[PDB]
Amino acid sequence: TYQERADELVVKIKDMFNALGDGDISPSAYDTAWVARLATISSDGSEKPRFPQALNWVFNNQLQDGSWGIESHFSLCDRLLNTTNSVIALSVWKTGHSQVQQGAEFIAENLRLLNEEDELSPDFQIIFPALLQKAKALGINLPYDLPFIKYLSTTREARLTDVSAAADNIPANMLNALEGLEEVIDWNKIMRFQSKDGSFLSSPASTACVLMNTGDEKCFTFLNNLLDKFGGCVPCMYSIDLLERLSLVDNIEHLGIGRHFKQEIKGALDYVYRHWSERGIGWGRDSLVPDLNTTALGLRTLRMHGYNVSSDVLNNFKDENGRFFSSAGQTHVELRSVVNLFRASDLAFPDERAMDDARKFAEPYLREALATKISTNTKLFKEIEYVVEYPWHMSIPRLEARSYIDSYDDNYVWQRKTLYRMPSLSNSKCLELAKLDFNIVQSLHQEELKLLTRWWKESGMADFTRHRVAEVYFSSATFEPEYSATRIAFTKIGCLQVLFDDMADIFATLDELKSFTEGVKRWDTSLLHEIPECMQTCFKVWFKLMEEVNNDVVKVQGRDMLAHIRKPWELYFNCYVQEREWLEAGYIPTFEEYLKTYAISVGLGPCTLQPILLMGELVKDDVVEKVHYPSNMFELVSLSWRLTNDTKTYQAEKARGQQASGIACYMKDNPGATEEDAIKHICRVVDRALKEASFEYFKPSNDIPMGCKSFIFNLRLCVQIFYKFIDGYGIANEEIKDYIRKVYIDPIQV
Ligand SMILES: CC(C)=CCC/C(C)=C/CC/C(C)=C/CC/C(C)=C(\F)COP(=O)(O)OP(=O)(O)O
Ligand SMILES: [Mg+2]
Ligand SMILES: [Mg+2]
Ligand SMILES: [Mg+2]
């Protein structure tokens, strides 16, 4: 069954957490081959392998065709690098004679395929042509004459003279291809780029290379220690204790299964944070040079979990043009590191220039990548497209999880200088759990919808089907199974409010409206007679619901909360009549005056107080105002709701007779301003409001219940996603109607 498989999945993924160390990463033929060339000189002048095991590994790990690398994952450049080097390793100690000839065949055959646009992995035209230089010297028989290989070697020899013309020698940004530049490297100065673990850029190949040219001890102890840990081979990079912890947590959170691993996540992040610094961070704790991807993931993930971290760390990757690079040790920019840069900028607090600068670079780079570089039908295209099309402040949790489940690759191989695997980060158990769990929870949601559609039918509110209740439901955002009573009360209150609003700005007369809110202020049915039949029915459905919800509230909260609960309702209806009082007077308020009334009339208060009081967390009398109205985070969300709503609905409301709006009031305050000027200013206000709410949300708090705070905060999402795709002609390009099937109706093939 599903629940059983998910439970055993949770168990195993918890093991994975508890086992986290320096990193799970695959051996590297290329890197281990280099380690194997290292020579010790016996007293009898005869040279033998310094690291017997590393040669033994290359000996026993020839694939089939017969190259070295990753069987299930073939790649031209990767196979060429791995096999050639492996061949050179065997040849040097003249052994593995069969694999040599066997692999020499694989190379010769495939060399005639490097032509010519089959994109080359980073620094291929430097580390490979160097492998072929040593191939000649050993007499290995290969087609060195191909017009293409002669071009790669040409560019390399041209790149060598550049280092000769460097008073400071090899630039820091070519350190990646260290071992493809031996003949122009100053071996004293190069050492200035050694990490505290003896390694160069965490690369075993590079570290072997400097070991061979210098006999440096630290280089040796890094390699020796690594081989002993990997049982006689080496990965393409190590350690990766920082990257692995961050990606694991991010991937799980992103897959929608973060709630099952709260304690294990806290342990992983605590570890990372102890190694956090204003300088940025690299793959592992011992990196000399930080990298953008790990730092960007660190920023976002750490901030997301309540850690105090500064966006200034990003500037360590920014140049004069405001452009970012992946790492001072290389020339190429990694697409992934730019995705993570953008995603980190999603969590910007107000006045964080670095976040602004990151997003101004990353976004166009990302859209550029989508247009030219990435193939459409791919998981990756689908992943990056969601990142830019539904950024954080409009990313609905379930929709975000459903979409990432489809783009998460559990059979992925990363490409640095060669291909490697990180089993914790590309993990089939994570993916399976994510799907099983999504289904499990989806069934719960179906049942809630059923209950909700039933209510809409029986309540007589028939006089907008489930399709209108489903959109409110969808908008609840807070999806965890424990919060069912909260989501249901929210949806009912929300559905009623859409009704109350149509009543307040369309159907009711000022008098009918006033009478209604008097009925609310009295909290009884004494004034039912003063209002038409249709509004009598609304009031009664509403009032009946209040009794039912309020009884449930006593159960969760442990005592009467009626006095707290009446306040948001009164404030909300009083603001409604105030809207109408202005309209009757023909008065257009100032932008500020306008917000005072409309920032409340938008209705964040009533749809949140009763529901948060049902989540389970105790809300003390003096805390109500700290988490609900008028706390800052609450105001800010209310503001984003109001203003964003204005931009997409002011045109249709003005044709219906309404006057006041964010657009009209701004234009009245600012002579000469057009509607376009108003919208532009408004969106800047909304943008800043979202960022300040994040700052308020993540701020340390002693007495504000986190669940309750989270439910308010994640209500900002629904408004942003709803109106984002209305194209200013009024045409809704994307509609909530379409996410409903994906999130609530279609299960995930298991
Ligand atoms: C946006 C909708 C309808 C659903 C998604 C968001 C959601 C579930 C909100 C639930 C809370 C509710 C009902 C709030 C009140 C309902 C609101 C302000 C609307 F329906 C917005 O439409 P409007 O432009 O006519 O509003 P207004 O300018 O007249 O004030
Ligand atoms: Mg309206
Ligand atoms: Mg209204
Ligand atoms: Mg409106």
Distance CA 531, CA 328 (A): 72
For residues 457 and 450, the answer to whether their CB atoms sit within 8 Å is no
Determine which residue's CA is closest to atom 18 belonging to ligand 1: 602
3-state SS assignment for residue 73: strand
DSSP structure class, residue 748 = P
Q: Binding site annotation covers 653? A: yes
CATH architecture of 26-227: Alpha/alpha barrel (1.50)
Distance CA 514, CA 668 (A): 28
Q: Binding site annotation covers 437? A: no
Distance CA 363, CA 446 (A): 36
Determine the distance separating the centroid of ligand 1 and the alpha carbon of 593, expressed in angstroms: 21
Q: Of 467, 476, 488, 497, which is best to mutate to test ligand 1, by the most ligand atoms within 8 angstroms of its C-beta?
A: 497
For residues 327 and 279, the answer to whether their CB atoms sit within 8 Å is no
Q: Binding site annotation covers 486? A: no
DSSP structure class, residue 481 = G
Distance CA 263, CA 302 (A): 15
Distance CA 253, CA 515 (A): 49
3-state SS assignment for residue 19: helix
Determine the distance separating the centroid of ligand 3 and the alpha carbon of 500, expressed in angstroms: 8
Atom of ligand 1 nearest to the CA of 649: 24
What secondary structure, in 3-state letters, does 293-320 show? HHHHHHHHHHHHCCCCCCHHHHHHHECC
Nearest to 249 by CA among 298, 295, 292: 298
Determine the distance separating the centroid of ligand 1 and the alpha carbon of 722, expressed in angstroms: 10
Determine the distance separating the centroid of ligand 4 and the alpha carbon of 263, expressed in angstroms: 43
Hey, what CATH class is 1-25+228-440 in? mainly alpha
Determine which residue's CA is closest to atom 7 belonging to ligand 1: 472
For residues 129 and 180, the answer to whether their CB atoms sit within 8 Å is yes
Does 649 contact ligand 1 (Cβ within 6 A)?
yes
DSSP structure class, residue 49 = E
Q: How determined?
A: X-ray
E strands within 628-742?
none
- The Cα-based distances of 749 to 406, 408, 436, 480, 486 in angstroms read 11, 15, 9, 21, 29
Which residue reads 């976004």 in tokens?
363
Residue type at 237 in one-letter notation: M
Determine the distance separating the centroid of ligand 2 and the alpha carbon of 576, expressed in angstroms: 11
Q: Which residues are bridge partners to 324 per DSSP?
A: 318
**CATH code reported for the domain at 441-750:** 1.10.600.10
DSSP structure class, residue 70 = B
Does 573 contact ligand 1 (Cβ within 6 A)?
no
Q: Binding site annotation covers 505? A: yes
Residue 724 corresponds to which tokens in the numbers above? 């984002």
∠ Cα 286 291 297 (to 5°): 100
After which residues is the backbone of the chain broken at C–N > 2.5 Å?
Answer: 463
Tell how far CA 566 is from the center of its chain. 39
Instruction: Encode burial over 429-464: b for 16+ CB neighbours within 10 A, e otherwise.
Output: bbbbbbbbbbeebbeebeebbeebbebbeebebeee
Tell how far CA 510 is from the center of its chain. 48
For residues 41 and 215, the answer to whether their CB atoms sit within 8 Å is no
510-522 helix and 533-557 helix, angle to the nearest 10 degrees: 30
Distance CA 682, CA 698 (A): 24
Q: Of 505, 645, 648, 661, which is best to mutate to test ligand 1, by the most ligand atoms within 8 angstroms of its C-beta?
A: 645
Q: Which residues are bridge partners to 39 per DSSP?
A: 49
| Domains 26-227 and 441-750 fall in the same CATH topology | no
First to last CA, the chain: 11
For the chain, domain boundaries: 1-25+228-440, 26-227, 441-750
Determine which residue's CA is closest to atom 21 belonging to ligand 1: 645
Distance CA 426, CA 3 (A): 23
Residue 621 corresponds to which tokens in the numbers above? 């009398």
Nearest to 343 by CA among 391, 398, 397, 409: 391
